[PDB]
Design an enzyme around this catalytic site. Structure first.
Site, PDB file in Angstrom:
ATOM      1  N   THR A 191       0.812  -1.208   0.000  1.00 23.49           N
ATOM      2  CA  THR A 191       0.000   0.000   0.000  1.00 23.49           C
ATOM      3  C   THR A 191       0.842   1.254   0.000  1.00 23.49           C
ATOM      4  O   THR A 191       2.057   1.192   0.163  1.00 23.49           O
ATOM      5  CB  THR A 191      -0.914   0.058   1.210  1.00 23.49           C
ATOM      6  OG1 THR A 191      -1.733   1.227   1.115  1.00 23.49           O
ATOM      7  CG2 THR A 191      -0.092   0.122   2.468  1.00 23.49           C
ATOM      8  N   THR A 192       0.195   2.399  -0.187  1.00 21.66           N
ATOM      9  CA  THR A 192       0.905   3.659  -0.054  1.00 21.66           C
ATOM     10  C   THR A 192      -0.039   4.713   0.494  1.00 21.66           C
ATOM     11  O   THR A 192      -1.259   4.607   0.360  1.00 21.66           O
ATOM     12  CB  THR A 192       1.516   4.125  -1.383  1.00 21.66           C
ATOM     13  OG1 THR A 192       2.332   5.276  -1.150  1.00 21.66           O
ATOM     14  CG2 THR A 192       0.455   4.489  -2.387  1.00 21.66           C
TER      15      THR A 192
ATOM     16  N   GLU B  15      -4.069   5.040  -2.162  1.00 24.19           N
ATOM     17  CA  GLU B  15      -4.611   4.171  -3.185  1.00 24.19           C
ATOM     18  C   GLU B  15      -5.720   3.320  -2.580  1.00 24.19           C
ATOM     19  O   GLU B  15      -6.005   3.398  -1.385  1.00 24.19           O
ATOM     20  CB  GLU B  15      -3.500   3.307  -3.769  1.00 24.19           C
ATOM     21  CG  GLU B  15      -2.670   2.584  -2.718  1.00 24.19           C
ATOM     22  CD  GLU B  15      -3.252   1.251  -2.331  1.00 24.19           C
ATOM     23  OE1 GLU B  15      -4.048   0.727  -3.121  1.00 24.19           O
ATOM     24  OE2 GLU B  15      -2.955   0.751  -1.233  1.00 24.19           O
TER      25      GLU B  15
ATOM     26  N   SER C 110       3.957   0.278   1.616  1.00 20.61           N
ATOM     27  CA  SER C 110       4.942  -0.436   0.811  1.00 20.61           C
ATOM     28  C   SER C 110       5.537   0.448  -0.274  1.00 20.61           C
ATOM     29  O   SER C 110       6.739   0.374  -0.543  1.00 20.61           O
ATOM     30  CB  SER C 110       4.301  -1.664   0.177  1.00 20.61           C
ATOM     31  OG  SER C 110       3.879  -2.574   1.175  1.00 20.61           O
ATOM     32  N   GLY C 111       4.720   1.293  -0.893  1.00 20.12           N
ATOM     33  CA  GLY C 111       5.168   2.151  -1.971  1.00 20.12           C
ATOM     34  C   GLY C 111       5.536   3.536  -1.489  1.00 20.12           C
ATOM     35  O   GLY C 111       5.290   4.537  -2.168  1.00 20.12           O
TER      36      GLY C 111
END
Lengths: 203, 226, 226, 226, 226, 226, 203, 203, 203
Positions: I1-2, I17, I129-130
């Protein structure tokens, strides 16, 4: 060990072997794994011996207390639900047992409960070390249009196959047919030996 | 000023215990006796109105398939105490595996009544019970006091018809007796006490013979003895 | 001197239990009876002022889709007791998987009332209930006492209109009866008692037939019986 | 000798529950009613001295942005009960994610008051509340008794001006009504009761229409209705 | 017999709450008011004998460097309550990181007093406090009742000199006022009430202006106002 | 009818707190005062019979090597309270590593007395103490009330000889004074009060100067002052 | 095992297989994984059997208690929130279960909840061992403009693909369409066999 | 991270860097590790961020409660003793933090406390990842006859060396000199940049 | 995710997102990670889904209870302090979550809190994660003299870069600008698609 439970038209038949080990080392050639849990249902044993006998004692106690409070026998769905809730209130210090409870209330049932309390309805079930053999022969020969004598002959052929092809099972088979008419009747060992000698599975 | 709480008197009497015993004198009468190979309980059933369900009103309440109980006094305390006796009997069946002696059961029930006699801030049970059944020893027949006093009898009674029955049973009771004659003697006892309503009723009667289980009679069999 | 706390009398009566009775005599009257294949409850609804929401005032309160309850006496004790009966019924539905006997439910509720009868420092429940519903046994109809006494009836009542109704029901009640005639008999019972306000009302009526669930009637159907 | 503790009377009345009522008769009067697409609360505000901060004295206390509350009686019990209602509503918003029915909230608050009615060694709450707000069902308007009794109303009041208001509202209330005319009717109700100080005041008034949140009026808007 | 324990009266008054009130009327008088950009507290200090340490006797007890408190009534209950208010304010400074609103603090302190009003077996606090200080909202000034009642004031008093001061402050108080003139008005208030000892004293006075901390005055500055 | 339990009076006085006072008026008199660089305690020692061990009877009981205590009233409550003060001082020496202020110690001891003033079912402490010692601030001298009231004095007394001593100390006490003249003034104070037995005794006297520890005098030095 | 839940226009369709194993050793060729949890929503099962049945019992109980207290059905967001809070009050003795609850209140929903209680809204979801197959075919063929018959045909094609390409799933499919009009209706097995023979996925 | 604390004649100087990572991945180029714990003492941070900030909140609260109860500031030995007892009441669920508290009461002190609560007096101390560099330069250049300006110049040279030779430290230095006269004064960043440009450690 | 959170002049912009996985196996192409926590602040999600949603429910509840008790909105320092104390009262059975709360009270803030409760102020932050991609583009293009449209364009370019260069993130971006004037406004997806097609990041 091995168990078997078969539902037919108006009865349900359960049987176990009697050999308790408790070590590798088969130690007791005559145990007891088939229990009368109530006047119209019984319970079989295929797990750790101590945990299984404690569960048998508790369920005898709870069903007798039940019938004595309400003057009605317990439904088979109710006894499997109770046993599932008991086994699943403690699963991180669990009972290493594979129970199987069958009986007749208004229609015959035989239920299976694993160590985590998974109850599921089925018309023929089995548990224990020598379980896939009796599932094989029940799958190959079983029909739901059998009589009580054909059912108990199928049971004896099943447990005899499990004895001939497994180490953990063995010893004398005991069988009890539970039906609505005659109630809980456990067959004497002389009739079981007569059925074995009639089917020709003796050596 | 004359002590209405569970404390002592200047002569040494427990007044709340007493007052609960005169509560159980207002109850429904009941009776038990031993016969040749067992024990029977006979409970009067004063069906007052015609609206109450005649069948399912039970005073002979089973504790186990080998110990039975019938009660008198406050019926709510009766039901709670019989439920405690049932769970105590089933805990003994868990722990020791079989009910070897009914005396342990009646002593635990009587000590449960003693605990509310003893401490303050709770009234005693206004209820009196007799227990019956067979065990390893044989046919047994107990009593239970609101004080907690137990006594094992050959033949006893409980309820409003206490004195007239126990007078009949000191006059006419015999030790070893077949079941039909024993229950005829019991119906004669209950008729001897209850001659104030000038009709007895159809009561409820139950028995056990050693080796067997309880045979509570139906409505049709008890009318043939009557 | 004359004992206003949950302790015994010198004749053996619980005064606070009486005083929670005669509290329940001040309540709203209600009634239940068994019919041919089920049981009905009929609750009077004395709508006093015209401000109160006529629809959502309910005395027939469901415990489950197969056990119903209607009450009289202190309405707050009523609501708390009905909530305890609901959570006890749902705990039985968790544990034993189905509601086999309604008698276990009414006995647990009555023992809950007994526990506040028993101990000191808490008043009893000033509330009286009747339970109705079907089970494995059949259509059942209980009563519940502030003492904890339960009685299974074919036909009973509760509330201020106790005596006149139970007189009508010892006079005119029949055992097996179709539902329309049975509820007509119930409305005639309630009209026989409530002839002191010289108008009955539109009451609320509910029924169950075995195999089905509860059909609480709307406002429009009950006016056609009236 | 006439029983001043939470126990029963020989006719069966809770004396402390009465005495917590008639405490709530001494409180500040308040009122609520349903209108066409919502519900309004109107609270009298008797500003006695000129020292008290005129703005921040609030009786209309929000429980949530969709349930509001206004109270009468002992103001400390009011504040503690409103705080318990707030944390109960927020626990329902945690557990069930949305406030589906305001009835669960008022029933938990009323059972909280019942718990201090029931047990000994604690007085009841001397406080009376009405709840208002919308939910999945629609605009709701409850009451809350020191006994714990709840009643859903179309239009109700609470406080010292109980009887005159409820007489005005049985005389002149209509079911579906626009908001301006409904709050004009409410101010006329409060003026009808409070004609003993020969001046009403500037009270505080709040409303909600379904789909919206609470619009508590400022000081300037309520003077235009007056 | 006229109700001396924390239970209700038949008119609905808590007599122990009254009796903790009129205990607080025997206390030493104190006062607070809001001025242009803050709030001041002024506490009378009746130095009775010449033995007591004139400096360290304080009745301006800080809860935080942005909330202060002055008390009246039983001084031991005062000290315990101020200690609980201090640890509650510091727990809020732990948990929420800053003291955003002083209202949460006074409501927790008032609910702590309510808890001893409510339950049995403990007397209420015989003590009355006013809180002062600034927050995100602005300068605030509360009161605290032995019942638990809080009221936010522009200007208030507490102690034995209640009525004469609040009469002076309904007569002569103005809303926005510089600090020197406001504290001159406060000394004139205290002199107006305390004209029974025909001398006022040198009292102790403290203030805060928003953005700053507490400036408790020394002995030398307060004599220049006098 | 005049309230003998820890609840309030209709004028607002705690009667048991009074009765624990006037119990402490029956105690043994004691005294403390500040001098130039420290504080002294002087305790009268009425040796009644000649059998009691003259040496080991001590009223000046050390809490720490920098805080001392002497008491009056019920001697058992005195011993229990001094033991609690010792373990509280040692818990402060564990937790904060040094005894920075003696005021925390006397406030914890006074709140311990407040807790038995507050709750029901326990009598207050019938005991009155004064604490003395030096800290980071300087030489301190407290008092302790059965109510829990503390007051910091320059010079005070406690016990049966309260009023005559405090009259002598309002008449003749000076602030900064060398130790020999200060203890001569203290013996003159005790002789001024105790002129009813027409002999004073040899009392026990103790002192501390800042930077040093306690120098309790022996029997031989105190006779040279006398 | 496998589940499937598909939201369309004015209905939501859920279906599971019926094969319980409980070992490797497929033991019960006719279980029950699709449950009616309330009169307008249902719940599927894709986890450990005992834990999943205990969760079904508890949620049946809690929703019935809910409707009996308030006389309104529970919102789907509310039942997923309740289930998430229950599963996340205990996650270090967790329930090894992958639940999926769907139903209609004013608009149809189907929600997915993992073993740690992560609730998330989606229009089509699935759980179990044979899950990526039915996600593949739903991604390839699914459109939101379908009817109820097209939806249940898509469901049967999905679970048939999962049976043909997975070991853990199998046995007879049971399907229940829950809609606002007819309420909770579970399709009889004869109609399901008719749809299978019409689509030609039988062998 | 890095800290520094230097005791001189009549003052004590503490400074940290401001770079928080919280990952490897330096994430926050402007944090806060130097805290005013009371009006005459401060506390620095060289550990896990959450645990360290909770300890800062608790010690702010406890010292403010202390001063508000007794109207005297807390001794530095007392605050280190309190912090040691707090950290050592729980060491098997410990706070992974290396604290350093300094201040002046009647004589300046700077104390160091590890994660197990070991308090020890020293005239110059430092903690964090970039600690041995500032210990090296303090050992090489430090004298106890310095002034406040010489002390803060030594501090800036130290933390600049730690920034030039360490990865975990970095970002803008903030310094606060605490003395008896002026109380707690934190230097503005413009004066710190002026001292950096005067010493010529800028690039 | 980000996630992303950017503070500018008089507003603060947050966006995530919407892709939830919950497995490797991206399972939900439309989740919800951006939450309105109060009328002037919001909270983003970058952790384990169940734990993160439970924290969102609790903080919604606590802030609503707060505003309803005091009639003032909560400061951003107060909400991060509360969240830090909650996460650090339990860290040995911790929530595996990386929270980020931003909002405006008298000046805009965006705060970051890790799984151990480390709160730290910064003007632009991100988690998930991003995360390093959006930190790269924010470091390269971000200036504090931007407008709201320039800010949300920078946000869309950031999350588009994270989608193009990361597996865990993806799906449709949702953005909500929270400012003092208009309050909490979440942008509709049509305007977001218009900004994507204007910037030319579509394929």
């Amino acid at each position: 060990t091995t168990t078997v439970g078969i539902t037919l038209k108006d009865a349900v038949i359960m049987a176990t072997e009697r050999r308790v080990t408790m070590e590798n080392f088969i130690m007791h050639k005559n145990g007891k794994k088939l229990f009368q849990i109530d006047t119209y249902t019984g319970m079989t044993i295929a797990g750790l011996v101590g945990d299984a006998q404690v569960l048998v004692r508790y369920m005898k106690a709870e069903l007798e207390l039940y019938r004595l409070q309400r003057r009605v026998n317990m439904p088979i769905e109710a006894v499997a639900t109770l046993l599932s809730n008991m086994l699943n209130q403690v699963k991180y210090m669990p009972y290493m047992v594979q129970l199987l409870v069958g009986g007749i209330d208004t229609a015959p049932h035989v239920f299976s409960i694993d160590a985590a309390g998974g109850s599921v309805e089925d018309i023929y079930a089995s548990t224990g070390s020598g379980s896939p053999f009796v599932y094989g022969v029940l799958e190959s020969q079983y029909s739901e249009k059998m009589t009580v004598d054909e059912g108990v002959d199928l049971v004896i052929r099943a447990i005899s196959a499990a004895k001939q092809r497994d180490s953990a099972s063995g010893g004398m088979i005991d069988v009890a047919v539970i039906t609505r008419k005659d109630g809980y009747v456990q067959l004497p060992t002389d009739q079981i030996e007569s059925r074995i000698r009639k089917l020709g599975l003796i050596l | 000023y004359d002590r209405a709480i569970t404390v002592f008197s200047p002569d040494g009497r427990l007044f709340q215990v007493e007052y609960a015993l005169e509560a159980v004198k207002k109850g429904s009468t009941a009776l038990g006796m031993k016969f040749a190979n067992g024990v029977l309980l006979i409970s009067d059933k004063k069906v007052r109105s015609r609206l109450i369900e005649q069948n399912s009103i039970e005073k002979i309440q089973l504790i186990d398939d080998y110990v039975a109980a019938v009660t008198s006094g406050l019926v709510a305390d009766a039901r709670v105490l019989v439920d405690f006796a049932r769970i105590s009997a089933q805990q003994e069946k868990v722990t020791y595996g079989s009910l070897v002696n009914i005396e342990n059961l009646v002593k635990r029930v009587a000590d449960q009544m003693q605990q509310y006699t003893q401490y303050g801030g709770v009234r005693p049970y206004g209820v009196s019970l007799i227990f019956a059944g067979i065990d390893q020893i044989g046919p047994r027949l107990f009593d239970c006091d609101p004080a907690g006093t137990i006594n094992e009898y050959k033949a006893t009674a409980i309820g409003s018809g206490k004195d007239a029955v126990v007078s009949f049973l000191e006059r006419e009771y015999k030790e070893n007796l077949p079941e039909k004659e024993a229950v005829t003697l019991g119906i004669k006892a209950l008729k001897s006490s209850l001659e104030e309503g000038e009709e007895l009723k159809a009561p409820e009667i139950a028995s056990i013979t050693v080796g067997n289980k309880y045979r509570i009679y139906d409505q049709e069999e008890v009318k043939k003895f009557l």
